[PDB]
Swiss-Prot record, chains A, B:
Listed name of the protein: 3C-like proteinase nsp5
Residues of the full protein shown: 3264 to 3568 of 7096
Organism per entry: Severe acute respiratory syndrome coronavirus 2
Activity-regulation annotation: Inhibited by pyridone-containing alpha-ketoamides compounds 13a and 13b. In turn, alpha-ketoamide 13b (tert-butyl (1-((S)-1-(((S)-4-(benzylamino)-3,4-dioxo-1-((S)-2-oxopyrrolidin-3-yl)butan-2-yl)amino)-3-cyclopropyl-1-oxopropan-2-yl)-2-oxo-1,2-dihydropyridin-3-yl)carbamate) inhibits SARS-CoV-2 replication in human lung cells. Inhibited ex vivo by michael acceptor inhibitor N3. Inhibited ex vivo by compound 11a and 11b.
Cytoplasmic side: 1-296
Cross-link (Glycyl lysine isopeptide (Lys-Gly) (interchain with G-Cter in ubiquitin)): 5, 86
Length: 296, 296
């Protein structure tokens, strides 16, 4: 019983975190096999308008740090906005792949400073391709991940905080989420929306755990999106399908839960669900399927 | 920027989790040096009223499981409600101690099934000595911990879920938090209260991160506890003292923040703080001092 914002165990990722120094700038890097991944803005100084291709550095200009042992850069390259440092092969490398996630998907974040992990928490790729993270200076290079069976699927590396306090970064192959670029120019987070399918999944979690917000109506998929728009991401057929298992375990049809969400949006909560006074949207259907016990 | 429910990295604890089987019952155990700690109710069958001292088992009756390698019990004893299994010495043992925490203190929980970690989350020892955890069957033996410098301070082992859905367990030396006992008899969680000093710490976090709820009044410590009682744990001088650093970093005196909390309790929120629509009370002052960057 209960329901918590739950991160994957961070152990297989702690063994990969390292320090990357270049000049005066130090940030975090990720050590997988003999390659070290980190944000390319680690070669930067001033930054107002860097031409990153601008070839002026040597291998021996990058100091890598794996605890106390110092690593030796033997080759370097740049892939998109990520720097890849070949070094003379981490024994603690797990099974891992790099994946680029869709907005609305969740992951765990291992926040790190000077290559030393500090904490772990959950968050979602918002529909506007920012993440509401928790990051201070020197956190760049912290990564976000999911763990499936025994495989670490890396999906985020932190690069940047925006003026509204949310965060932007890239997949592990260096492609930013959103329209953001790694330079010190004005860039704002776009208008955000609420992740409907995830709110719905969370209502099913509330039901699985034994809880008032239900009602007797239904709605059409179209009529539901009409109301949602007024407050929320349109809900697709594929969303309905994805909510399938949760609907069968609970015997509440997807479109009945939508009618419930409709009412909750129209009348407010009048006073909490799973310990929350607002509609949470950072649990996926997969995340909810914690109520069942999946380990790794 | 940002503020999240943040767990310690769970890596130093994942290396300690094992399986403990006795008869038909399997649960989780903790492997430190050559000793394996687990809930003593693992020797039980029926349970309506066990006399645990009742000596009838052999060493070879306990099957320990460290991944795939099977461990051999060479000695056993019982300390309070925890069983200690001597086995033929975990290479992955960290620096660790056992501490028994005061109510209102927070810790991370590594939820585990069949000795395999499943997830990590934060929670607090409630004033009624329960924890609002997230636990399914087979979670018994999962532990809760804090990490200071490089030392894992274990403070909780899970034993039991109560009918209201909250959870009860022991320190790692087997002493239950609260008046609970490990047998299948009627036992209810007592009336709970809100952890005032932690609400206050969270308001300071809101201020550190740049946020409306402040006002110009003050209050006496006595006058504050008067109002709190009507809604909250009395706030002591020692609490005020503990809030010292946060008050100096922000330039808002403790008793000014209390006046703010007074107003917030009297008038509600009128519509969120740090992404929450209710007054959060599972961050300590220490936890808030994430806004500063402490790693381990
Ligand atoms: O309008 C706007 C205005 N912004 C201007 C600021 O531009 C950038 C661009 C880029 Cl590529 C990176 C950063 C950035 C660098 C560093 C950093 C620098 N040096 C070190 O040695 N260690 C470090 O960690 C840290 N953090 C940061 C701070 C707090 C939380 N999380 C990330 C950055 O955000 C900042 C752009 C967005 N849109
Ligand atoms: O009024 C009341 C009524 N209660 C009656 C129930 O009593 C107990 C007593 C004791 Cl000592 C332990 C449990 C208990 C055992 C097991 C368990 C059993 N066998 C296995 O093989 N694996 C397992 O995990 C699991 N969980 C449990 C379930 C869900 C979440 N987290 C913990 C228990 O809670 C239950 C007492 C409280 N107050």
């Amino acid at each position: 019983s209960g329901f918590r914002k739950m991160a994957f165990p961070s152990g297989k990722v702690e063994g990969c975190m390292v320090q990357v120094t270049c000049g005066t700038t130090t940030l975090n890097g990720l050590w997988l096999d003999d390659v070290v991944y980190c944000p390319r803005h680690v070669i930067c100084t001033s930054m107002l308008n860097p031409n990153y291709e601008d070839i002026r550095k040597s291998n021996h200009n990058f100091l890598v740090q794996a605890g106390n042992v110092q690593l030796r850069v033997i080759g370097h390259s740049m892939q998109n906005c990520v720097l890849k440092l070949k070094v003379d092969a981490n024994p603690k490398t797990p099974k891992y792949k790099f994946v680029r996630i869709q907005p609305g998907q969740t992951f765990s974040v291992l926040a790190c400073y000077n290559g030393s992990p500090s904490g772990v928490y959950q968050c979602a790729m918002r529909p506007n391709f920012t993440i509401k993270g928790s990051f201070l200076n020197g956190s760049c290079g912290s990564v976000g991940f999911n763990i499936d069976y025994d495989c670490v699927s890396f999906c985020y590396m932190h690069h940047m905080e925006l003026p509204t306090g949310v965060h932007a970064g890239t997949d592990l192959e260096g492609n930013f989420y959103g329209p953001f670029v790694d330079r010190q120019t004005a860039q704002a987070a776009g208008t955000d929306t609420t992740i409907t399918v995830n709110v719905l999944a969370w209502l099913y979690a509330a039901v699985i755990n034994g809880d008032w917000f239900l009602n007797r109506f239904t709605t059409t998929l179209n009529d539901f999106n009409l109301v949602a728009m007024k407050y929320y991401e349109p809900l697709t057929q594929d969303h309905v399908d994805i909510l399938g298992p949760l609907s069968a375990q609970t015997g509440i049809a997807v479109l009945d839960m939508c009618a419930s969400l409709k009412e909750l949006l129209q009348n407010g909560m009048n006073g909490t669900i799973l310990g929350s006074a607002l509609l949470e949207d950072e649990f996926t259907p997969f995340d909810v399927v914690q109520c069942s016990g999946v380990t790794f």
